Write a structure and sequence with these properties.
This protein has a 5-stranded mixed β-sheet. The chain is of the alpha/beta class. The radius of gyration is 19 Å and the shape is globular. Helix 1 crosses helix 12. 40% of the residues lie in helices and 19% in strands. The relative contact order is 0.20. The structure holds (2S)-3-carboxy-2-hydroxy-N,N,N-trimethylpropan-1-aminium (DCK). (2S)-3-carboxy-2-hydroxy-N,N,N-trimethylpropan-1-aminium binds next to loops. The site of (2S)-3-carboxy-2-hydroxy-N,N,N-trimethylpropan-1-aminium has 9 residues, from loops.
Amino acid sequence: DTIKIGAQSMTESEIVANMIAQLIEHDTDLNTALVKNLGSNYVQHQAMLGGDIDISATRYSGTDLTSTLGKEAEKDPKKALNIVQNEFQKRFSYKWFDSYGFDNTYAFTVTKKFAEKEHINTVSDLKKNASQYKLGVDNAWLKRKGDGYKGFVSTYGFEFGTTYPMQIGLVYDAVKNGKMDAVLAYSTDGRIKAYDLKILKDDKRFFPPYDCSPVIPEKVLKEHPELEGVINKLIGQIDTETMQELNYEVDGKLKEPSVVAKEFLEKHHYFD
Ligand SMILES: C[N+](C)(C)C[C@@H](O)CC(=O)O
């Protein structure tokens, strides 16, 4: 009886996956295995449907609402979460838990020099010379329905000069070093504050909310009745500002996700 915890290929997914793994083994006689390097929410969900994972560490409400459930991008945090919770329960008997306490949203990120020099505050301010710009984005966002590029173009009414898809990890330096004029960063990445970068305002509210939660089949929670109490320790416990520091511990200071998670868990006494 080994619990299989899925980690997406994001620093944040890996930290949180370890944090779950360690809290389980501390509180239980259940032992754990991490399934690393799932490329996306789709990969994660597919893996859960086939029994390959028992717990998703990091799922985001807007992402699964638009892709896995095939729904419109609901723009309200609370409403988005409810539809996602009721749909997972109703559709797969999966439990989409309440969030850890943090939203990890797509954010248009620029250097401050660039925003001074181009008079930029908002995503709409980009429109003026948009075709002059190089945008850095992740390997999937351009192909996404609902919350992807196509949606952005029909919402903000403009497109960028060129778009470059890369690994999300690398957009923080590419924007900093001038290789890109703007990137679509993730808001919880600690390098944004660490590089004194500017988040632009989503003035048209194109993006749905992206509250982060764990997901486990009830089938699993039935079997291991002591498991839900463990996950519950972490519910509402990590705000965006905490997640930003944790992320940076791996990203800036180059620590193993397991070390970061253990240090976090030690600091809060494993929450009893
Ligand atoms: C992190 N974000 C919420 C913006 C999206 C992402 O996780 C996409 C996915 O899981 O494929």
